[PDB]
Structures are given as structure tokens and as C-alpha cells.
Amino acid sequence: TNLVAEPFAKLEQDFGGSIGVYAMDTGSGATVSYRAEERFPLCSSFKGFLAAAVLARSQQQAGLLDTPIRYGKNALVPWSPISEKYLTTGMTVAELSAAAVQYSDNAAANLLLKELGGPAGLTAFMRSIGDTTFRLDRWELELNSAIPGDARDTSSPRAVTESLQKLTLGSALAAPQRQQFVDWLKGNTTGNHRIRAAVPADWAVGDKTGTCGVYGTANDYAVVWPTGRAPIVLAVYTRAPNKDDKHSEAVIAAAARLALEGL
Template sequence: MTSHDSSAALSRRSLLAVGGIATVGLATTALSAAPAWASAAGPLGTRSGRSSERMARRLGELERDASVTIGVTAVTHGDRRAFRYRGDTRFPMCSLFKVLAAAALVQSRGYDEAYWSTPIPFTDADLVVDSNVLDKLDPQQATPGLLADAALRYSDNTAGNLMLRELGGPAAITAFATSLGATRTRLDRWEPDLNAAVPGDERDTTTPDDIATMYSALLLDDAAGVLTSARLREWMLRNTTSGARMRAGLTPPYELADKTGGGEFGVVNDAGVLWRPGRPPMTLAILTRTDRPDAVRNNEVVAEATRIVVG
């Protein structure tokens, strides 16, 4: 496993409201004695420092059993609690960027009805791998709304690239992330190159803390506007790609607005906001990676990490 990055504070107001976020499991073999939950009381029961350390130990065991590196940040809103396991460690972002692209597009053009009703043309040269929605379109054109729907619900890579093109390129995602308080998130390339996930390459990376910061801000705090929050929820609540990942680790009834991502070196990600009856929303970011170019994507790692943290 690679060395861990230095600690960084969560900076968006939804996470600042959590108060002092203690760190657990910054190294698998050296767990912090401080509790990861900043408060013991709340709808998840009595999460003592001991139970937090137990979660961290189980994540460490999962890492060893599956030969992966796992990063988790979970924030329970409204009761001042957060849990972090390698929360400030860099991981490949992969398709998690598509939420930011859609959000930035709605924030900038959301009330321009003519823009959202006008199809954007593309050609065969624009089509890239894993574009199961756009590669079936004839004629080759899609409204911005269809691009966002394809990118967020089906993780269509061509749709992601076309949204990037509308925004001016990958640098726009980095700037948007910074505006949300996520200072360790950067997008440098287009699909599918951004999924290369080469260990040590900081291009196209983020942290679990940053993803939790941004998804909380966008889906719960209306940080990019009420319309942006509403549209993101509409798309992400109907995501079709996480059935074997985060959703596989949850017990109904629940509603989940999430986005998955995957790349080379066995990268498997899932992140979103979880709603359950009688409980405040939880923002959960689970990112994984390996150092092996021949590693296969292990969806069950994300599902089991979800059971450990949410269960």
C-alpha cells in the first residue's frame, strides 16, 4: 500500500457543522485512539470510540482480504458526527466527476430554457468506450438534459465528455470543485484517459473527504443553487449502476442518490447521499484502488464497506 497523504480539514459548511472530525484508521496497522464519531448520540445508536475503532478494524481486515486500499468518509447530518478512514488520501476520481460536470452545467445554464431544449450534435469521432446511451442515438444529437441523464444514471462516457466540452474542458471541474471547498480534487483529462488510475499519478484524483464535501454541498446544502440540487437528486436517485456496489450493502427501506466510478488498477468507487426513514441524511463516499495493473474491479468491496459503515 502507498503512503498516506497529510491530514486535511473538510471545508464545506455542511462538514464544518460536524465539528471536530476525529480520524480513525489513517493506517491499517495503527488505528487512532480517538473516536471517529464526534458525538455518541443520534439515530445511528451509540457510536462510541470503541465501536468506531471496530469499524476501522473491519475495514482494515477487508483491505487485507481483498488486497485493496479503501477510503471512506461518512457524514451524518444534523447530529455532529463523521467517520473517516483514509479520508484525506488521494484516489482516482473516475466517473465521480460527472456529478460535478452536471452540477456546473445546471448552475451556469439552468434557467436558460432554450439551451436545455436544443440538441447538441456529436459525431462518430466523439464516441468513446462505455457509452451505451449515446452510441445508440440516431441522429447523433442530445439535449443537455439527456447528456446529464446518460452520464449520471448510466455513466455514459461520451455524455461526460460532451458536458466537459460545454464547460470548457477538465480544468472547469477543478475550478468548480475548488469553489465548493474541495481543494484536493483535480480533473486533467477526458474520458476514457482519466480512468488510467496509475499509482502515484495525481492527475484526475480526489479524496473521500472532498467527495463527501462536494456531494453534501450539492445535494443537501444547495451550494450550486436550489435548481441544481433538485435536478441532481432527480438524476442520481434513479442511478442504474450501483446495484452491485453501495446498494448491495444497504437494507430497505432507503433512498440513495449516488454515482459510481471505475478505472484501471481495479478502481471501484461509489458515493452519494443516503436517506432512511426517521434518520438524518448520510453522505457516504467509498473509494478504492490497488497497485496492480492486472487487478479486476471488486464491487463486493464497496458493498461490504457500506455494510460496515452504515449497518
């Protein structure tokens, strides 16, 4: 819990919806929590964990990452800029994972989900590193419905942070695989106005965003490297109760700030 929750409550009330935060200092063990136990839509942030499910297989399947995929045009659901660009060449499993992570590429996420046996398969992976909260049920783009109280395609900020720590900094992935996942996260292009905007620009960050396009539901999670110190892992999710509600990158940044300053 949190005995100085007031800063977050005010931010949430001003926003009009739900804020969800869970931050961990790996070095000290300190944590900041606000609706950290409550379910929020993953939207696109599942793609980070997806690439990690991929990097995990690649430890048993050699050359999985270099495997080209010659996808067709009807793989190209909206918001697939990298896939769209590379339609004519195809793309490797690695490049798909990269584009999944750093551009939120929709088609590339679906192509990887297929290689792993769909949402249930990604969900199996996360159960296998100790996440009993995460569940992916659907593909892009239906998984973005963000319907109030729908448990499909949801996790909790703390289980997202705890899983992210396992895959980037602990033992769930082999050291190189682990380095590749952190490197993919560090090259993200979509998170500049969210958690990154709350960090001092001297700290290395890798993050993955999600944006459902409805119900003011948007999110981001991150590993952040302070000067001289163990890294911080955090997740900041949002939703709102009207379909019409606009999400807010500012609130995600602000809530991340409050977590970082809490720590």
C-alpha cells in the first residue's frame, strides 16, 4: 500500500479516471504503489513481454531470431509502420520483435503471437516466470476494447513491473537474450512524452508504451538507470470510464514523477 497516497489521489481526481502505479528501486527494495493491485488494459504494452517470450524460445530454437517471415498484405492491420515499410522484403523474427517493441507495430505483434501459439501462448510464457496476473486473450486490434471491468487482455501495474524486472535484470532470460530485451526497450521511439519525460535526461531508459485508443486508457513501463545506482523498474497505467475519454500522456509522466520522487 501507500501511506502518502494523497499526491496520486489528487492527480487521479484531476484526470477523471483511474491511475495505476507500481515502482521498485532494485537496490534498496523500496516501492511506491497506487492501484498497483488493480487490473488495467495492456493495450500495446503486451508487445514488450511478447518480444521476451520470443527471446525465451530462441534459447531452445537456434536461428529462430534470424528466421525470415514472408508475410502478406493482409497481415497489415492499422498502425503497422515497419511491417508496411518492409512488406516487399519480409522481415526476420528479430526485426519483428524489434518493431513490435520500438514502434508498437501491430502486424508484427500478430505475426509473433502466431509463432508462439496466440494470446494463450504468450499467457503461458508469463505464467512460467511467475506472473499469475497477466492474461492476453485477443489479438491486435480487438484487444484494445478497454471495456470497464473486462478482465480480457489485462494485467496489474505490479505484476507488469515484477515481470519486467525478471526479464530485464534477473534470471528469466539467458544473459544475451536478456541484454537484447533491454536493448530493444532502450531503443523505443514511442515513449518520449511518458515515463521518459519524468526521468532526468542523464539516465538511460528503456520503456514500452500501450495506447488503446478509447476509454482514456494508455500506459507505459520502464527500466530506468540512475547515476551510480541499481535500476528502477516502474509501470504507470491509466483508464477512464467513458469510451469518449481522451487518454493523457501528461498524467502518465506526472504519475511516474510522483513515483520517482517517492522513491
